[PDB]
């Protein structure tokens, strides 16, 4: 049987009722090695963990993608006025920074 | 002094609080609920039992013809049979071959054991909650049956307490109830006069001694065997016995929230649902002044034991200094820790050892002792039992067990991405301004 | 066979209807409510009465001192007075000048006439309407108490009739009720233990013989006169007498909808509110074939007299030619006019007289005699009495008394305007086409 924190009770024949109560001793260690905290909060709070990891992965993916997008657009906006000059001569400092030729 | 609070609807567990008048001594209040009933308004309709087909002796006339004289007994069948040559032990009964006549007459009456073996069909609605509180307000304790409608006060020592109505109108009992043998069932019995043959209520006596019972038991008289004096019938079996053979289990074993159904008043017990609000009309005489109670100076709190078990598995230790030796209240204003005792008796330079209960992994609460606030901080550890035989003595706060390591993983992998996007936005702004500066040249 | 109908909740006035099975004889139904009760669930909280201040005899110690011994009597006061010089008829009692001591003790007890003169404070909720009907279904007539919840059927001759619940949950009673001497009051009494002196319920005994009463009567002991053995006291006067002096009138004088408050149990009777739905479960054996009943040919209805009064003030003569002499149903389908009788016995060539009742100045209602349909048409006249002493036997149809002349005035003033505006629009269209024709030559 599955016993939760809200209680559980059985009666075995002519015996009196036995009530039981679950308490929060989940397998895992919540203090390090981050594949151990995820199993701990998965056996502990199963529904909330998948939603939390989904939204944190989504925000991390959107942030890395948008930062790469903005950096590549800014590199293009820097190097384009020095790549339309016939005698291209991108500076030195912008060659080291913007990773030019 | 009007003080309102709220108590959870759960027996056995002591509920503690204090009242802080802004310039006086704190007044501790303790309420421990013992037995919380729920008594519906119960309305008897009918009882039922086993029936007992009574049969009159066969009226026999030799070379004659009888008639059917009714009696208006319950389900009273009667029929007249012709062409009968009955026998007694001392030979034949008539001399006529044909044109003899035997009358069968049967009726339904209720059984002889109806008094001690019957089932009561009721109707219930609009229950009434009633608790056995054990209140202590300023070391003055009473034990009184309070009623928990929004009125009907309990009065003691000038203090008026009105424990208001439950937050939920839930009852375990349905609109219809059958009581049999100390146990109570949610059965949809038919109405009076609607009793069907072969099922529950084929007999419907209005009370136990009503002497007017409705009976629909599918009784049909049959023709007697040639040469015998008997009354043969054929009816559907006892619907009360067939109800007893099926009998989906009692409400004692099936009730939600763990109720405890009892019999002599039909009532439920200790249904852990809802919450009781409270009103305290406290007179001004009980508020003792500040300087008539001890008051600490230079106190400090440390945690000896810290296990986030179900009961009081934490020990905080307070080293204090105060220039009196008396008792004073302790309380935790948040629901972070649930303390065990409500008062600590003090020396002038000793230490205090309190017992609390908590769900947190890194407990940081602000303990209120006599009139001051210390901060008790530590680290709790998981308990050794998976399953205990007592309920919970604390409240699971949302974000209670978040374990500072995981706070660090949520701060870095979610706040650091914001740092990435703001330095990307700053870099984009600087690039746009530098392109516009470059094209200022013409 | 399910036949659903709805009866107005009003005693005494008969209700008539017929079941029109499509190929069988019409089946008459006649239901006359006699007494419509309305019974709330009623819960006794306490009783109250006049009180009686009990006094103890004064305990005098000659040159000593006394103490207070509490007897725990209700509202008990015990003050002890020093410096007394009491007196009997035989001279002085003590012989000292000072230092004598007298103890006065007073307490409140309920009166000796509590049993036959007291007010009972109840709580009401969740009424349960019940009705004394008188039901005739196809010359099977019974008189039987019905319960008008949506079940609990009444059974006679295989017909199963169930009176549905009221369309309104109105009760004349409030949440709180006082009964005093056959009369019932919506009165907001204080709760038990919440009584105030000088008002209702300063004395609160839980039952009539409870032997535990709550007394809050503002009893104060005073100091006796020099040289007199008596117990002086001051208290607020009796609130049951002051409540009898106030007493806004009973609920049988102030209740709306014509209700009649009685108390053998607490109930209202004959309230003219709401309406009872009915449910007929007619079996398939009551339906006689058409050919075993009379059936008419060439029937004609003429109105002899016609008064649109409140009683039956209209006489219609129906001349028929019957195939067979027997009683059959008469009925009006609409609520245009309400007949008096539910059946008419026929000869073969006679002329029948029916009594009806209408609010119409110009009634045109289609009668239903045995299976045909004649059209009764005429004109009614105003009655002569302004005020009658019997309620209304018919229904108030909207636009029932329009008096054909005013139909002509409304039709002229409402139709001539529409005629004028449509001929104006047609004239505008013709003028536009004539302009477009004359401009064509361009």
Curated annotation (Swiss-Prot), chains B, C:
Give the transmembrane region(s). Answer: 413-433
Positions annotated as glycosylated: 134
State which ranges are Extracellular (membrane side): 5-412
Q: Provide Cytoplasmic-side residue ranges.
A: 434-442
Region feature E1 fusion peptide loop, mapped onto this chain:
84-101
* Membrane-topology descriptor: Single-pass type I membrane protein
Record-annotated disulphide pairs? 49-114, 62-94, 63-96, 68-78, 259-271, 301-376, 306-380, 328-370
Q: Which domain of life is it from?
A: Viruses
Q: How is it modified after translation?
A: N-glycosylated.
Where does the record place it? Virion membrane; Host cell membrane
Quote the subunit structure annotation: Interacts with spike glycoprotein E2. The precursor of protein E3/E2 and E1 form a heterodimer shortly after synthesis. Processing of the precursor of protein E3/E2 into E2 and E3 results in a heterodimer of the spike glycoproteins E2 and E1. Spike at virion surface are constituted of three E2-E1 heterodimers. After target cell attachment and endocytosis, E1 change conformation to form homotrimers. Interacts with 6K protein. Interacts (via fusion peptide loop) with host LDLRAD3 (via domain LDL-receptor class A 1); this interaction mediates viral entry to the host cell.
Q: What does this protein do?
A: Class II viral fusion protein. Fusion activity is inactive as long as E1 is bound to E2 in mature virion. After virus attachment to cell receptor LDLRAD3 and endocytosis, acidification of the endosome induce dissociation of E1/E2 heterodimer and concomitant trimerization of the E1 subunits. This E1 trimer is fusion active, and promotes release of viral nucleocapsid in cytoplasm after endosome and viral membrane fusion. Efficient fusion requires the presence of cholesterol and sphingolipid in the target membrane.
What's the protein name?
Spike glycoprotein E1
Q: Which organism is the protein's source?
A: Venezuelan equine encephalitis virus (strain TC-83)
Give from-to of the shown chain within the full protein.
813 to 1254 of 1254
């Amino acid at each position: 049987f599955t016993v939760t924190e809200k209680g559980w009770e059985f009666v075995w024949g002519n015996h009196p009722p036995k009530r039981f109560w679950a308490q929060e001793t989940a397998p895992g260690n919540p203090h390090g090695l981050p594949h151990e905290v995820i199993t701990h909060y998965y056996h502990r709070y199963p529904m909330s963990t998948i939603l939390g990891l989904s939204i944190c992965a989504a925000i991390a993916t959107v942030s890395v993608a948008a930062s790469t997008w903005l950096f590549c657009r800014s590199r293009v906006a820097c190097l384009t006025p020095y790549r339309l000059t016939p005698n291209a001569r991108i500076p030195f400092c912008l060659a080291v920074l913007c990773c030019a030729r | 002094y009007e003080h309102a609070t709220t108590m959870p609807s759960q027996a056995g567990i002591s509920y503690n609080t204090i009242v802080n008048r802004a310039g006086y001594a704190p007044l501790p209040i303790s309420i421990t609920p013992t037995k919380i009933k729920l008594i519906p308004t119960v309305n008897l309709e009918y009882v039922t039992c086993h029936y007992k087909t009574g049969m009159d002796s066969p009226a026999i006339k030799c070379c004659g013809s009888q008639e059917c004289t009714p009696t208006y007994r319950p389900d009273e069948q009667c029929k007249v049979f012709t062409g009968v040559y009955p026998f007694m032990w001392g030979g034949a009964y008539c001399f006529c071959d044909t044109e003899n006549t035997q009358v069968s007459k049967a009726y339904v009456m209720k059984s002889d054991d109806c008094l001690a073996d019957h089932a009561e069909a009721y109707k219930a609605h609009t229950a009434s909650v009633q608790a056995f509180l054990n209140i202590t307000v300023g070391e003055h304790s009473i034990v009184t049956t309070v009623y928990v409608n929004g009125e009907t006060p309990v009065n003691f020592n000038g203090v008026k307490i009105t424990a208001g109505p439950l937050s939920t109108a839930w009852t375990p009992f349905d609109r219809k109830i059958v009581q049999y043998a100390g146990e109570i069932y949610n059965y949809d019995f038919p109405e009076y006069g609607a009793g069907q043959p072969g099922a529950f209520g084929d007999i419907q006596s209005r009370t136990v001694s009503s002497s007017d019972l409705y009976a629909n038991t599918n009784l049909v008289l049959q023709r007697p065997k040639a040469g015998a004096i008997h009354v043969p019938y054929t009816q559907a079996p006892s619907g009360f016995e067939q109800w007893k053979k099926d009998k989906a289990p009692s409400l004692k074993f099936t009730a939600p929230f763990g109720c405890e159904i009892y019999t002599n008043p039909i009532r439920a017990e200790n249904c852990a649902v809802g919450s009781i609000p409270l009103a305290f009309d406290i007179p001004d005489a009980l508020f003792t002044r500040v300087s008539e109670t001890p008051t600490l100076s230079a106190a400090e709190c440390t945690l000896n034991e810290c296990v986030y078990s179900s009961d009081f598995g934490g020990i905080a230790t307070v080293k204090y200094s105060a220039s009196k030796s008396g008792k004073c209240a302790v309380h935790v204003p948040s629901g972070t820790a649930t303390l065990k005792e409500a008062a600590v008796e003090l020396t002038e330079q000793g230490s205090a050892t309190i017992h609390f209960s908590t769900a947190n992994i890194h407990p940081e609460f602000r303990l209120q002792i006599c009139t001051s606030y210390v901060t008790c901080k530590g680290d709790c550890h998981p308990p050794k039992d998976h399953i205990v035989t007592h309920p919970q003595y604390h409240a699971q706060t949302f974000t209670a067990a978040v374990s500072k390591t995981a706070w660090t993983w949520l701060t870095s992998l979610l706040g650091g991405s914001a740092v990435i996007i703001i330095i990307g936005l700053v870099l984009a702004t600087i690039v746009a301004m530098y392109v516009l500066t470059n094209q200022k040249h013409n």
